[PDB]
Amino acid sequence: DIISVALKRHSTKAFDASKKLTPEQAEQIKTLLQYSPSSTNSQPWHFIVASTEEGKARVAKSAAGNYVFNERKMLDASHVVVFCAKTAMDDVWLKLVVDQEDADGRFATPEAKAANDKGRKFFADMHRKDLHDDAEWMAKQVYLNVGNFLLGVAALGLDAVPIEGFDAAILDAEFGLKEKGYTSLVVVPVGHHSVEDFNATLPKSRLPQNITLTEV
Amino acid sequence: MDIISVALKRHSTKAFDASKKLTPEQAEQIKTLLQYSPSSTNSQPWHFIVASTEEGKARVAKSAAGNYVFNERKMLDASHVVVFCAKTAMDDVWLKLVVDQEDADGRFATPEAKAANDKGRKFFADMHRKDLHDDAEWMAKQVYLNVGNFLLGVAALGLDAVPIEGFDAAILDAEFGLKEKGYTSLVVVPVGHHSVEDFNATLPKSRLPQNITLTEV
Numbered sequence A: 001d002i003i004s005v006a007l008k009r010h011s012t013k014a015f016d017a018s019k020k021l022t023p024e025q026a027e028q029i030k031t032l033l034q035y036s037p038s039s040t041n042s043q044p045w046h047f048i049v050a051s052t053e054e055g056k057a058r059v060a061k062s063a064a065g066n067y068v069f070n071e072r073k074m075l076d077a078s079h080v081v082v083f084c085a086k087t088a089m090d091d092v093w094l095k096l097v098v099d100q101e102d103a104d105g106r107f108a109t110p111e112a113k114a115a116n117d118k119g120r121k122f123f124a125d126m127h128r129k130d131l132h133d134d135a136e137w138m139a140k141q142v143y144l145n146v147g148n149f150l151l152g153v154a155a156l157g158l159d160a161v162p163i164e165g166f167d168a169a170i171l172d173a174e175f176g177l178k179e180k181g182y183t184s185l186v187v188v189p190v191g192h193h194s195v196e197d198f199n200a201t202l203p204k205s206r207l208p209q210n211i212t213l214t215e216v
Numbered sequence B: 001m002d003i004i005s006v007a008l009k010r011h012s013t014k015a016f017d018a019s020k021k022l023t024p025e026q027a028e029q030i031k032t033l034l035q036y037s038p039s040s041t042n043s044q045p046w047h048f049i050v051a052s053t054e055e056g057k058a059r060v061a062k063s064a065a066g067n068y069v070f071n072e073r074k075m076l077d078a079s080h081v082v083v084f085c086a087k088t089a090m091d092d093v094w095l096k097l098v099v100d101q102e103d104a105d106g107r108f109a110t111p112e113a114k115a116a117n118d119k120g121r122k123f124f125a126d127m128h129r130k131d132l133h134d135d136a137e138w139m140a141k142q143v144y145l146n147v148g149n150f151l152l153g154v155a156a157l158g159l160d161a162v163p164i165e166g167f168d169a170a171i172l173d174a175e176f177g178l179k180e181k182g183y184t185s186l187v188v189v190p191v192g193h194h195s196v197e198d199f200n201a202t203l204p205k206s207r208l209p210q211n212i213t214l215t216e217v
């Protein structure tokens, strides 16, 4: 029952470090990251999955200054996912995507592949050549991925918290992301909440539909 | 899984069967999904237009013009069509609305707790508006996060859908007078049941391998 899932999930404020993902769950979260949809199947993303003490410590360097309120979450969760966007959309990536779609059997003819490549480049060029918003466009797809992910991990029976409160320059530097062509956007600790998670027992709150939603 | 299966089996529907409508229950449930998405600071910087009448869907479909004409039938034939909109600016009235709703819903034990929450939210809001100069993008990002939640959600309800960026947001904004109301359209998502014309229903799903996209540490 996915509505039950959506209503019962919450942003976890404290994790029980002793409660690890099962081997299975650890693979299933990777599956979720991989299989998110994205505009033109552009998949303009990279994920860091930190499951070791050393790994999580490296990520937690980013919870500095104004962001110390997020350090323990990064340290204490079983697994921590860093969602990264490409910094620019290049033709090598676009060829990578269409070639993969071909390998997977999505095209019956050379003509169908070529039409798919043309359609993808129409959108990619709109953003990188005309609007000059390809960095934002790609970051949007990564956020869509995050939204898919948070509901998915909840449906697996796992706790999570999305985090924008981190220093992306520190995180990028720690993992050499800039030279690799990526930048960190959202950190998502995944695991099981502790009794210290004050948010597990508080009511959820949302604006009423009479403000946010119009039916036509 | 109960959800991995859903993720592996869902697809972007290319054609809908117009006769197959959401049940009243399903129509309620999709509204619940829209409302209950998370967002940075619970800022909820969004508005939704849910078109279910033929006349409503037709108005939305007006945006699929020019380069986007072969997204029109998706928008007309689906049972329900959701227009995801972002706020164009994050005003103090909205920030107060959010914290007052949290207070109404019992999230604060004291006035001091409420004030601390409001202060933290205004901190992030001001950073985006004043220093990063990306407040529009920041809000749009929350809307895209909502879309991701929504696509999985509807798939898990056993409903077909397709996310659509192939539309003219200026036309759509004008049709529904969004600019003046402080909003702009980002993504259109028709929801319903696919038809035999949906060529994508039977094709294998394709993603880049994890050895390219994923690093374990």
Ligand SMILES: Cc1cc2nc3c(=O)[nH]c(=O)nc-3n(C[C@H](O)[C@H](O)[C@H](O)COP(=O)(O)O)c2cc1C
Binding pocket: A009, A010, A011, A013, A070, A161, A162, A163, A164, A165, A166, A186, A199, A204, B037, B038, B039, B040, B041, B042, B145
């Ligand atoms: C993109 C994003 C970033 C967020 N950043 C943080 C964060 O840095 N620290 C934190 O504790 N919560 C963070 N949150 C959690 C939000 O406050 C939370 O989603 C919102 O209050 C709604 O509550 P819920 O997630 O329990 O439904 C963030 C949420 C989102 C969607």
Ligand SMILES: Cc1cc2nc3c(=O)[nH]c(=O)nc-3n(C[C@H](O)[C@H](O)[C@H](O)COP(=O)(O)O)c2cc1C
Binding pocket: A036, A037, A038, A039, A040, A041, A144, B010, B011, B012, B014, B071, B162, B163, B164, B165, B166, B167, B187, B200, B205
């Ligand atoms: C933000 C976004 C916009 C998209 N726009 C369109 C669109 O305009 N027309 C269309 O047919 N499909 C659209 N798609 C569907 C993508 O092509 C699709 O998600 C991708 O090829 C992966 O396929 P899947 O959704 O079947 O898993 C869009 C998807 C996303 C996430």
